[PDB]
Structure formats: C-alpha cells, structure tokens
RNA sequence: UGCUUGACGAUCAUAGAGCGUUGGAACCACCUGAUCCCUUCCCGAACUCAGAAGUGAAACGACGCAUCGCCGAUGGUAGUGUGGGGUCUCCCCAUGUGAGAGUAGGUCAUCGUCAAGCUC
RNA sequence: UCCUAAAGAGUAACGGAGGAGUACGAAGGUGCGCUCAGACCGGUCGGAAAUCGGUCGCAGAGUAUAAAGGCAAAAGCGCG
RNA sequence: ACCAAACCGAUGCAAACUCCGAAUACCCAGAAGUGCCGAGCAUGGGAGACACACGGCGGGUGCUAACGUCCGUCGUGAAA
C-alpha cells in the first residue's frame, strides 16, 4: 500500500493528535471532496479500500486524487510476549485525520454520481465524512 | 576655470568657501581630542587677556592659557565646550566651559576616548525621571459597577463630563509585558537616552524626535493600541515586544545632520 | 573591483583587533600617486590627526615616492604630538609592509611619535 | 540492535542574564559553539565559555552584520 | 449585492467567540488606501446569501455600516474547517482609481461540442480556477470566458490562449510563468 | 482609597502562589473581612486569587 | 551656507540583486619597460617599485530606473497562565495573554569625524 | 552528540538513533598572501566526467576523527 | 504511441527539519503592605527516609488498553 519508499528513522512516538485543519480543508484540484468531520487517523488499507470502491462505481473517466498519505510507523508488539524488552517492530503505516481534512477529491463527473460514490467511500473509513463544494 | 555647479549664488559660496577653510585652519580640534585628565592650551577671547600683536599659532588674537579638560557637553546640535577644572569662569560658576573651537592645542592626551562631562543633577532631572511616568490606567467611575477592564470612553465623554455625584478614578493594573503611556512624546525621549538598549548609541546622532512621534502616531499598530480613558488626552496601552520592535523599525530613518540642525537654530535665534 | 575588497578582507583582522584592545589606530592608504595617513580614536569612527600629501603646502608632483611618503609620515608625527597622540597601533590596512609604507612607518618614529 | 548508553549532561547553559552585576572573572554562559559571540568586556575562552573581564552588567545585544548575538557588560 | 453591518467595539477571542454563538453575528474589517481599518460585525445569514451567489466574490458590494455607505469588495474569506461556515471577512475599500487586484471565476462555457471530446476519447480537467485579475474598478469582470471546442486530443489551454478582455491585466502572466488551464487527455 | 476583601473558599487544597498571595494580603480564614490599601501591587495579588475573594467595595 | 571625491565608522537586505546617461579634478585601476627594493608551489594581472609617455570605456566610483528579495500592519485564528465544566485518547466556559502564514503598499536607505577639489 | 526534556539547569525506562578506549614534531605558534561546492561553453588518443581558460556563483564545500553547535577577524588553503 | 532529469505554478506532512514564534517558567534592580512576629543564611546536636499510591495537565512504552510501567509539574492519602 501507500508508505514512503524510504526513511530517515525506522520508529516514531504516539504523539497526540489535536486541533482542527485549516490546511487542507480547501478543495484545490476536484470539484467535489470528501472530508472528515471527525478525529482519528486511516490504516492505510481504508485507503485503499476505499480508493477501489470509487474508481470502480464511476468506470467511465473522471480523476480520482488522494489527499492524504500515510507516513507514521505505528509498532505492534506479538502475542505472548511480556512488557519491557524494547519497542516493537513496524506493522503497519497510518495516517492521522484531524477535523475539515480533505481526503478525496473528484471531478468530471456528475453531481451526483459523486455523491453516491463518496457514499460508498465513507462507509469503509472510521470517520464521519461531509460532502463539500469547490468554492 | 570651471564654472562651479553650485545652487548657491557667487558671492554667497565665497563666503562658504572662505569660512570652511578658516575653520578648517583656524580650529584644528574637536570634541574628539579631549578624554578626561587631557591637558590643553586653549586661546581665550579679549576678556581678561591682552591682545597680541605677535601671533605664534595659526589666527591667535588673544593669549592661551594650559589647563587641564575633565569632559566635553554640547551647548549646541554641532557645538561643544570643554569643561576644565579651574573654578574662575568670570562668574560664580563652578568649572568654566570653553567652545572647543577656541583650542590651539594640545600637550598629554587621557587614556580612553573623549568623555562626556556628567553635569551635576538638577532637580528639574530628578522631577522629570524616566520612571516618573504615570505606571498604571486611571479609569472614571460614573456609573453604578466598580470597572475592571480598561474600555475607551466610547461617546460618554462627549454627552456627559459635567455633571456627576463625583469624578471618582479607580487604578487599574495592567499585564506585565505591556506599557502604559500618557504622553509619547516624553516616552520616546527619556527613551533613546536611558534604555539600555538603545543608551549609548545616539552619542553621534541627532534624531528628529518630532517626526519620530509623528511617525509612531501614524503606525496602525499603536493607533490600535491607543485608549481613550480623559477628554482631552490620549493615552496608549502597548505590548512592550511590539512597541520596540516598531521603534527599532521606524529609527534608523530618523536622522538628520548636526551641522544643518545648528544652522537652523543660529538663524532661529539671529532673527 | 578585485584588489579593493581583498584588501579589506585583509586589513580588517587588524583592524578589529584594534578596535578590541582599544588602542589609537594610525591608519593608511596607499594609491598610485600618492598616499594618505589618518590617526583615528579608539572608536573606530573618529578622526584625531591627519597629515596628507593633497594640502596646500606639499602637492608638488613628485607625489608618489618612497620619499614623498617620508614626508607625509614626518608631518604627521607632528600633527599626532600636536594632539598629545602617542602608544599607537600602526595599521597597513592590507598593503603588503615592505615599500612606501614601511618609509611612512618609520618616518613616524623618526617623528617622536612611538608605537 | 541494542540502544541505551546516553550522556551525562554537561550543564550548560546561559548564566547572569542582561539586568545581573558581574565580578571580574565570572563566568556568564556556558557554551558549545559559539551561540554568543565575544562582546567588549568578555573574553570567549578555551572552550568558547564567555567570561567577563570588568564589571559592569550584562547587556545582551545584536551588533554588526550576519546577525550574531554579542555578549558585552557595560560600567553601569 | 447589498449588506449592513455594526461597529464591534469590542475585541479578543472571548468577545469574537461570544458573537457566533449568541448573536449569530459574524466580525469583520474595512480597511482601505485612504482611511484607517475599521472593525464590522455582520450577520451570517447575510453573508451566506452573497456567499451562494455565484458572481459576488469578483463584484463591488456596497457596505451600510451604519448610516455610512462604502463600495466595498470581498478578497478573503476565513471559513471554519470542520463543520463548515462562514468567519469573519475581512474585505476591502473600493477607491474610484486603484490597481485593485482581485480573484475572478471561471466558465468553460463551450464544451459541449470539442474536437477531443467527439473525435478521439473524451476528457476535460479544469486544473485551474479562480483566476488572479489585476483592474481598476472601473469594469468590472464577474467572469472570463473560455472556450474549448477547438483544442483537439493532447493540446492543453495556458495562460496566455484565453484573452483578458479591455484593460485586464494578468499578475501570472506578469511573472515569468504561463500556468495551464484546462487539459484534453484520454480516459482510463 | 482602601478596598475591603473576604476570604470566601480554602485554602487546604490550592497551589503554593495563589496560598502565599492570601497570607500576603493578611488574611486568615473564611468569612474574615480586612482593610488593605488599594495600591497597583496589592489588588495585584486580588487578581491571582480572584476565586478566593469577595471584592465586597 | 551648495556639489564632487578619499579614509575610517553608527546600523546591517525598508541599507540587497538587476536594468541607462556619465566624471577629467584630484583619486581609480590600466600602462612604458621591470632596470633600482620586492614578487611568482611557473605569471610584473596577485605583490612591489620610477610616474602619468598615455587612457577614460572593460574595471570600479557614486549618480537614473520598483521586477525579484526584504519589511509588514489592523482584524481573525491557532496556542496558553489561573478557576470551573462536558459527550473527558478531545473540547468548552469566565478572565488575561496571543502567535505563524496571508492580506493595501515603501525603498535606488539614514547618519559621525577628518582630508581634498570647484569660486577666490 | 541529538530527541524523549514540557523555549534557564536537571530529569527515568531492557525508550528511539549514532560513535570513542585515537591521531599530528606538523595536522602546534607567529608574519604574509588565496578562495569553496555545484551548472554551462570551449579545448587532440580521456570525455557524463582527469589537467586548462572563461562566466554564473553569493559556502548548498571543508573541518583528522560519530552527530550537535559554530567558522569572510574565515576556525578552510599555501609559503618563510 | 512509454519513460524522463532540470525549472515554473498550485498543494500536504516530520521528536531526532526551521525564514519564524508565543503564553507560562526563570534570573537581576527599585519600591508599599503583609509574614504570628518572623520569613533567609551559616555553624553544631538528634534524626527519620531512600517499595510509594491515586487525580488533573504535559510526555515515553503499551493497543494514545489495563487501579499497567517510567518521567516533569500541583493536589490528596501516606500522616486528617
Ligand atoms: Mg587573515
Ligand atoms: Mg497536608
Ligand atoms: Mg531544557
Ligand atoms: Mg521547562
Ligand atoms: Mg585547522
Ligand atoms: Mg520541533
Ligand atoms: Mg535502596
Ligand atoms: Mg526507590
Ligand atoms: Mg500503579
Ligand atoms: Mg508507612
């Protein structure tokens, strides 16, 4: 799937994830996007997931863009392992989503066609997602 | 011959010519030639000497005498007198002071640069301090609630200011990385002259003050700042970081030549 | 150009360690035909005394020399003692110390003005 | 593999800031390459550890070109 | 396009805050070339009229602040990200002879019927929208047309194709840039 | 003039500034009412325990 | 109470980069040959020396011209000290503070001491 | 040496990333002189490149040694 | 009829990236009042402690799970 094709570090924290997003919340490309109105962060298979359920309900033309890119390691220790002998190795990569992030963009499609796309988009993702306009 | 380019008339650059090459002849010597504990011959005027047939230094009329400089202050924008440690003067004054231009020369140098005689503090100084500024807001109390926020008058000045129970002024604090200012001008003197960071830097220059305030009046960021809390004045509450970074801004521009500003006021003063 | 800021790049080491042991600095330009001399406070933007061969007493067009620079560094060892100058620091602001600078530095000493 | 092994924190620094009174010899930062440059009275010794030579109080200032931070206490 | 608003005479976050929630208002500025800025409140129902309007952002909007009346023209718009609203405006001063740069839409008006679209396989993509504009107020573009029933299969439109019509200036174009604006490609 | 201040909340769970800023304006406990020059230092140490105090006038 | 120019500075892009006309009156290099000092990891351009037989443009010197760079408001937003709350991995309220980016637009900088030339 | 470390110091984990248990008699001291990396054009067997000339540069090179912080008073380079 | 450096324009993200940059926290100087009548410092006598627990705000690890584990800063219990 979607990660970098190379590092400059192997591991990175938890963090935190606050505060809304003023950049990236304006749809530059498309006509119509898909943003979410809630806070969490995609595995980077939703991604996919949901890359393949647009491109396959249009099958006639249109231009698909993907906003948001997964970029932080996120570790996951085995089963039957105890607590406190280093950090786990790297699984998976995620994307951290944040409120009014733009996630897909389209156009040359329908008005409504879209939407009814971006229905089937949001339902393999964990967030709530709005439907919004170019302005 | 070349036909001089000049905006002045003939005989008008006679004159310049003539009087730079006799100061440039005549007066040899400046402020910078005299630290503390220098030791200089200085050519009087008519008073108290006699006048010289037989002339040894460049245009002496009069008889010099040797003494010794303790500082140099300027009694004009490009003119300055030495201060000397002989008490006479003529008068009653403590040190005498001497135009610097009345100087032949010099015998021992001091150690260091030319030091900036401290006169002696008047209490006019004392009463006019930096830090004698007023401190914090003084708001009126008309109505009813005790006020806690610093607000403009906003129009009550202009239907009401004589007619109240009492003009009660409560002192409001303010948060500690602003200033409080009743008068720019004074702000921005004292300012320049005992800030540290911007202490010793004007010894060499001379700024429009004026023009400064004008200036910083026409910033949009102090007219943000401003606050009306009295009729007939104009107080301002400003953020210290942005207040000096303006004033840092705007300086530099602000510079004009001594020798212009001392002309200027030699002709105030004629007419 | 191309000499003139290699010699600043050169001169300024002096320059402003002078300026840091606070001393009276006698500087000096040298040009094509002729050369100059200034002895400056410790400020670095103070002139104190100047002797130079453009007055009105020395311009006489042999101007230029090695020996035209012993009097311009005999003259101003007057004008230095005139200001009661002495324990001066000798800048060559970037001239190679070998010629008509080093005929100007010694005609300072000879002048009674000591570094 | 294995990652531990940090340093023991050296304890730098910047002491008596811009409003302090200073003694002769004292040390005013500890530095580890020149953060602060030499300003008139302090002496960037050895290990580039500015210490005072005078009294007088600190200062703190911007001088000259390329933005370098000047360390110099003045007689006040 | 008509709108009146209030003084606000009162700042900070709390006070902006306290504005949305109970007042439903909607803070704002007017500053100009020849007068200080001078902080508005407006409603967001108002605003949200003019914001649905298609050519009002590239259009002089006249501005009753209280009894005064100003030419005034929209060249920013802070918008929640989240949810998505209206914040405060922050427009401009109209003056009779100004430069006066602004942003003006785009139409593509003439589409239906192009040389890539019937003859080979046919995709159009507006990469661009909102063109910059750079005119007196004086004329005013609400929009500039273009036209794209001529450029045939692989040819893409630049900057300089479509014309901007008595005595409109581009600031793109016055840069060392010439900015495509619509491609004519095969579909996937 | 002088403003009269009441201690209207404890002072067994708050921090070690706002504890000090009471003791400093010189009260004692709950309910005790006193005098205290209305300077810009001392209605300085209100601000910080506002939440504590009744500024009754 | 002028203009031109040299030296050292205040302050370091609101002081910078780029685009003409020019200066003979001293400098500015260039130049005759490098003889006399000095110089070339080999060079008379770097460095030095006897000036001016020559030269005013390449070079620099300041002196025109606001495209780029830099500066940058007001306002809002993010953030945050104190206290209290909610649907508590996050946010809100009262109070105080408050960025960064973006947004009309200025500028061919502003000054200190010495020295020289133009008229005499 | 950097982060975690919360804009003074300090601060733990079998927490995330790297190095050292040396070298220099000149690789030190002083005086005097000079620019780096990179792009392009030309130049015979070399050619994207070796050594040379020119321009654009405006430190993006270099530090004896790992990373951090600095270096046009160059802390980099050469000669007595 | 694929691919493609370099440059331009738009558009996102870094604890080990900064052209920038707060609020708080820190130091030094000047003052009014308060301090239960002392708050500080120094020299000595006696110690006890060196298994800590939970709550809020900031973090590492953990699955931004555990009344889980290790830190910075306050409160409570320990000892009300
Ligand atoms: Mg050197
Ligand atoms: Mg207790
Ligand atoms: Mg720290
Ligand atoms: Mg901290
Ligand atoms: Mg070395
Ligand atoms: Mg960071
Ligand atoms: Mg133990
Ligand atoms: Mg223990
Ligand atoms: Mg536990
Ligand atoms: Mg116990």
């Given at each position: 799937?979607?990660?970098?094709?190379r590092?400059?570090?192997?591991?990175?924290?938890?963090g935190?994830?606050?505060?809304?997003?003023?950049?990236?919340?304006?749809?530059?490309?498309?006509?119509?996007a898909?943003?979410?109105?809630?806070?969490?962060?995609?595995?980077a298979?939703?991604?996919?997931?949901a890359?393949?359920?647009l491109?396959?309900?249009?099958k006639?033309?249109?231009?698909?863009?993907?906003?948001?890119?997964?970029?932080?390691?996120?570790?996951?220790?085995?089963?039957?392992?105890?607590?406190?002998?280093?950090?786990?190795?790297?699984?998976?990569?995620?994307?951290?989503?944040?409120?009014?992030?733009?996630?897909?963009?389209?156009?040359?499609?329908?008005?409504?066609?879209?939407?009814e796309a971006?229905?089937?988009?949001?339902?393999?993702?964990?967030?709530?997602?709005?439907?919004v306009?170019?302005? | 011959?070349?036909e001089?380019?000049?905006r002045?008339?003939?005989?008008?650059?006679?004159?310049?010519?003539?009087?730079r090459k006799?100061?440039?002849?005549?007066?040899?010597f400046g402020?910078?030639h005299?630290?503390?504990?220098?030791?200089?011959?200085?050519?009087?005027?008519?008073?108290?000497?006699?006048?010289?047939?037989?002339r040894?230094?460049?245009?002496?009329?009069?008889?010099?005498?040797?003494?010794?400089?303790?500082?140099?202050?300027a009694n004009?924008?490009?003119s300055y007198?030495?201060?000397?440690?002989?008490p006479?003067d003529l008068?009653?004054?403590?040190?005498?002071?001497?135009?610097?231009?009345?100087?032949?020369?010099?015998?021992?140098?001091?150690?260091?640069?030319?030091?900036w005689?401290?006169?002696?503090?008047?209490?006019?100084?004392r009463?006019?301090?930096?830090?004698?500024?007023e401190?914090h807001?003084?708001?009126?109390?008309?109505?009813?609630?005790?006020?806690?926020?610093?607000?403009?008058?906003?129009?009550?000045?202009?239907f009401?200011?004589?007619?109240?129970?009492?003009?009660?002024?409560?002192?409001?604090?303010?948060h500690h990385?602003?200033?409080?200012?009743?008068?720019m001008?004074?702000?921005?003197?004292?300012?320049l002259?005992?800030?540290?960071?911007?202490?010793?830097?004007?010894?060499?220059?001379?700024?429009?003050?004026?023009?400064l305030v004008?200036?910083?009046?026409?910033?949009?960021?102090?007219?943000?700042?401003?606050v009306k809390?009295?009729?007939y004045?104009?107080?301002?509450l400003?953020?210290?970081?942005?207040?000096?970074?303006?004033?840092?801004?705007?300086?530099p521009?602000?510079?004009?030549?001594?020798?212009?500003?001392?002309?200027?006021?030699?002709?105030?003063?004629?007419? | 150009?191309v000499?003139?800021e290699?010699?600043?790049?050169?001169?300024?080491?002096?320059?402003?360690?002078?300026?840091?042991?606070?001393?009276?600095?006698?500087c000096?330009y040298?040009?094509?035909?002729?050369?100059?001399?200034?002895?400056?406070?410790?400020?670095?933007?103070?002139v104190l005394?100047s002797?130079?061969?453009?007055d009105?007493?020395?311009?006489?067009?042999?101007?230029?020399?090695?020996?035209?620079?012993?009097?311009?560094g005999?003259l101003?060892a007057?004008?230095?003692?005139?200001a009661?100058?002495?324990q001066?620091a000798?800048?060559?602001?970037?001239?190679?110390?070998?010629?008509?600078?080093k005929?100007?530095?010694?005609?300072?000493?000879?002048?009674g003005?000591?570094? | 593999?294995?990652?531990?092994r940090?340093?023991?924190?050296?304890?730098?620094?910047?002491?008596?800031?811009?409003?302090?009174?200073?003694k002769?010899?004292?040390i005013?930062?500890?530095?580890?390459?020149?953060?602060?440059?030499?300003?008139?009275?302090?002496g960037?010794?050895?290990?580039?550890?500015?210490?005072?030579?005078?009294?007088g109080?600190?200062?703190?200032?911007?001088?000259?070109?390329?933005?370098?931070?000047?360390?110099?206490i003045?007689?006040a | 396009?008509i709108?009146?608003?209030?003084?606000?005479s009162?700042?900070?976050?709390?006070?902006?805050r306290?504005?949305?929630?109970?007042?439903?208002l909607?803070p704002?500025?007017?500053?100009?070339?020849?007068?200080e800025?001078?902080?508005?409140?407006?409603?967001?129902?108002?605003?949200?009229?003019?914001?649905?309007?298609?050519?009002?952002?590239?259009?002089?909007?006249?501005?009753?602040?209280?009894?005064?009346?100003?030419?005034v023209?929209?060249?920013?718009?802070?918008?929640?990200?989240?949810?998505?609203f209206?914040?405060?405006?922050?427009?401009?001063?109209?003056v009779?002879?100004?430069?006066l740069?602004?942003?003006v839409?785009?139409?593509?008006?003439?589409?239906?019927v192009?040389?890539?679209?019937?003859?080979?396989?046919?995709?159009?993509?507006?990469?661009?929208?909102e063109?910059?504009?750079?005119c007196?107020?004086?004329?005013?573009?609400?929009?500039?047309?273009?036209?794209?029933?001529?450029?045939?299969?692989?040819?893409?439109?630049?900057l300089?194709?479509?014309?901007?019509?008595?005595?409109?200036?581009?600031?793109?174009?016055?840069?060392?840039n010439?900015?495509?604006?619509?491609?004519?490609?095969?579909?996937? | 003039?002088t403003?009269?201040?009441?201690?209207?909340?404890?002072?067994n769970?708050?921090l070690a500034?706002?504890?000090?800023?009471?003791?400093?304006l010189?009260?004692?406990?709950?309910?005790?009412?006193?005098?205290?020059?209305?300077?810009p230092?001392?209605?300085?140490?209100?601000?910080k325990?506002?939440?504590?105090?009744?500024?009754e006038?």
């Amino acid at each position: 799937m979607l990660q970098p094709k190379r590092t400059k570090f192997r591991k990175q924290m938890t963090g935190h994830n606050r505060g809304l997003a003023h950049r990236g919340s304006k749809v530059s490309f498309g006509e119509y996007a898909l943003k979410a109105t809630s806070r969490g962060r995609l595995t980077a298979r939703q991604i996919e997931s949901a890359r393949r359920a647009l491109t396959r309900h249009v099958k006639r033309g249109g231009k698909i863009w993907i906003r948001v890119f997964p970029d932080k390691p996120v570790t996951k220790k085995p089963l039957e392992v105890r607590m406190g002998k280093g950090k786990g190795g790297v699984e998976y990569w995620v994307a951290q989503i944040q409120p009014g992030k733009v996630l897909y963009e389209i156009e040359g499609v329908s008005e409504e066609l879209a939407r009814e796309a971006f229905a089937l988009a949001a339902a393999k993702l964990p967030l709530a997602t709005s439907f919004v306009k170019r302005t | 011959y070349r036909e001089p380019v000049t905006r002045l008339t003939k005989e008008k650059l006679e004159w310049v010519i003539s009087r730079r090459k006799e100061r440039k002849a005549e007066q040899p010597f400046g402020r910078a030639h005299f630290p503390a504990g220098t030791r200089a011959i200085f050519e009087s005027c008519s008073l108290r000497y006699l006048d010289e047939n037989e002339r040894v230094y460049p245009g002496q009329r009069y008889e010099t005498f040797e003494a010794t400089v303790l500082g140099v202050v300027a009694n004009g924008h490009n003119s300055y007198v030495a201060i000397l440690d002989m008490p006479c003067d003529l008068t009653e004054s403590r040190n005498k002071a001497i135009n610097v231009s009345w100087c032949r020369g010099i015998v021992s140098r001091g150690e260091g640069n030319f030091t900036w005689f401290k006169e002696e503090s008047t209490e006019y100084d004392r009463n006019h301090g930096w830090n004698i500024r007023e401190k914090h807001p003084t708001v009126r109390w008309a109505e009813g609630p005790r006020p806690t926020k610093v607000r403009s008058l906003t129009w009550a000045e202009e239907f009401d200011y004589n007619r109240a129970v009492d003009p009660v002024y409560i002192e409001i604090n303010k948060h500690h990385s602003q200033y409080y200012i009743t008068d720019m001008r004074s702000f921005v003197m004292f300012t320049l002259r005992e800030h540290p960071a911007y202490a010793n830097s004007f010894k060499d220059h001379l700024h429009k003050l004026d023009k400064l305030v004008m200036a910083l009046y026409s910033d949009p960021t102090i007219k943000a700042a401003e606050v009306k809390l009295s009729r007939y004045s104009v107080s301002w509450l400003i953020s210290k970081k942005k207040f000096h970074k303006v004033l840092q801004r705007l300086l530099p521009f602000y510079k004009t030549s001594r020798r212009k500003a001392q002309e200027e006021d030699d002709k105030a003063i004629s007419e | 150009s191309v000499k003139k800021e290699t010699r600043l790049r050169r001169a300024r080491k002096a320059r402003l360690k002078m300026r840091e042991l606070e001393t009276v600095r006698l500087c000096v330009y040298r040009s094509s035909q002729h050369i100059y001399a200034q002895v400056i406070a410790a400020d670095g933007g103070k002139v104190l005394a100047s002797a130079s061969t453009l007055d009105k007493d020395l311009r006489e067009g042999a101007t230029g020399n090695i020996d035209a620079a012993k009097k311009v560094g005999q003259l101003v060892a007057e004008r230095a003692k005139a200001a009661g100058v002495t324990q001066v620091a000798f800048d060559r602001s970037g001239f190679k110390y070998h010629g008509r600078v080093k005929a100007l530095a010694d005609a300072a000493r000879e002048g009674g003005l000591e570094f | 593999t294995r990652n531990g092994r940090d340093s023991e924190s050296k304890r730098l620094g910047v002491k008596l800031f811009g409003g302090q009174a200073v003694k002769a010899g004292n040390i005013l930062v500890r530095q580890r390459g020149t953060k602060f440059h030499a300003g008139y009275g302090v002496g960037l010794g050895k290990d580039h550890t500015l210490f005072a030579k005078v009294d007088g109080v600190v200062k703190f200032e911007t001088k000259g070109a390329f933005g370098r931070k000047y360390v110099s206490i003045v007689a006040a | 396009f008509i709108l009146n608003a209030q003084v606000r005479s009162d700042l900070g976050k709390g006070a902006s805050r306290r504005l949305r929630r109970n007042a439903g208002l909607v803070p704002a500025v007017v500053y100009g070339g020849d007068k200080e800025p001078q902080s508005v409140t407006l409603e967001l129902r108002e605003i949200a009229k003019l914001l649905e309007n298609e050519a009002a952002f590239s259009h002089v909007i006249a501005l009753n602040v209280g009894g005064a009346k100003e030419t005034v023209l929209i060249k920013a718009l802070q918008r929640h990200p989240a949810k998505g609203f209206v914040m405060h405006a922050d427009f401009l001063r109209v003056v009779a002879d100004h430069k006066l740069t602004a942003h003006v839409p785009l139409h593509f008006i003439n589409e239906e019927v192009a040389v890539g679209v019937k003859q080979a396989g046919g995709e159009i993509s507006h990469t661009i929208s909102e063109v910059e504009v750079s005119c007196l107020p004086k004329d005013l573009p609400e929009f500039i047309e273009v036209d794209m029933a001529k450029v045939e299969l692989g040819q893409i439109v630049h900057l300089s194709d479509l014309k901007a019509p008595k005595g409109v200036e581009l600031v793109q174009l016055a840069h060392g840039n010439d900015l495509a604006v619509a491609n004519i490609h095969a579909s996937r | 003039a002088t403003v009269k201040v009441t201690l209207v909340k404890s002072l067994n769970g708050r921090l070690a500034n706002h504890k000090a800023c009471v003791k400093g304006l010189g009260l004692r406990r709950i309910n005790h009412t006193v005098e205290v020059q209305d300077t810009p230092e001392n209605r300085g140490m209100i601000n910080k325990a506002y939440y504590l105090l009744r500024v009754e006038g």
